Amino acid sequence: VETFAFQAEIAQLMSLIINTFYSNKEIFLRELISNSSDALDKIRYESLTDPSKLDSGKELHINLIPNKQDRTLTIVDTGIGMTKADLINNLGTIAKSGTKAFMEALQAGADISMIGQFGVGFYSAYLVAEKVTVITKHNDDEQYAWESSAGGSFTVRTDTGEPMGRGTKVILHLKEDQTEYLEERRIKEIVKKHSQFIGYPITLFVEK
Ligand SMILES: Cc1c2c(n3c1CCN(C(=O)[C@H](C)N)C[C@@H](C)[C@H](C)Nc1cc-3ccc1C(N)=O)CC(C)(C)CC2=O
């Protein structure tokens, strides 16, 4: 298990997201679904030039899986996935500028729901999650688990759990007071409001 410091700008953003009073937390789900959709767009595009990129799975979809026993909501996609370099360095490097602009825009009167316009919508997960785990598999690399409970650090390790084939799972370990996001009616409501036109099937799993 390797431990890394977040880019300073990203630690600042995470603290802002955790500390700012902002009741409209439900927008986190749209941002995660958007990342999944963009990841699915990318593998679809790449597979046109190279059909073998779907050898790791032809199905292009998004699953939403609540688990009340574990107090987790997982967003699963069969998109392009992320390499180790993406997880550790590359996406966060790119996200530095967006992070800075967002925080500047908030100082000027924007609100937290506009986060996705700055390319850092992933971090909205911390509106509702105390810990986020990202399990991901890209065709060119092994399966990795990224994890952070904020506090300025994240970890990456090779994942020895069930092989995914290709794609990304974002596991939200929900805060004690955010369990409404495990309720079928609540998730259905948010998906219809903010994510009704996503171009891949979204399956909301129900609890046994
Ligand atoms: C930024 C950012 C970040 C993450 N994703 C993105 C978002 C980075 N990104 C974009 O902002 C695009 C260019 N608008 C490319 C996406 C789509 C990429 C391939 N897949 C993806 C990425 C993210 C989340 C889910 C998925 C996922 N579910 O696959 C996750 C992590 C690297 C742990 C931290 C972080 O800074």
CATH number, domain of 187, equals: 3.30.565.10
> Exposed/middle/buried for 128, CB within 10 Å: 0-12, 13-18, 19+?
buried
How many angstroms is it from 208 CA to the middle of ligand 1?
31
Q: What is the CA radius of gyration of the chain?
A: 16
Q: Which amino acid is at 64?
A: L
What's the resolution in A? Answer: 1.6
DSSP-assigned states of every residue in 134-146: EEEE-TTS--EEE
Ligand 1 pocket test, pick from 46, 64, 82, 144 with the greatest ligand atom count within 8 Å of Cβ, gives: 82
Signed CA dihedral, 26, 28, 29, 30: sign only: positive
Tokens of 67: 């688990």
Give the structural domain span for 74. 1-208
Q: How many domains does the chain have?
A: 1
CB 92 within 8 A of CB 6: yes
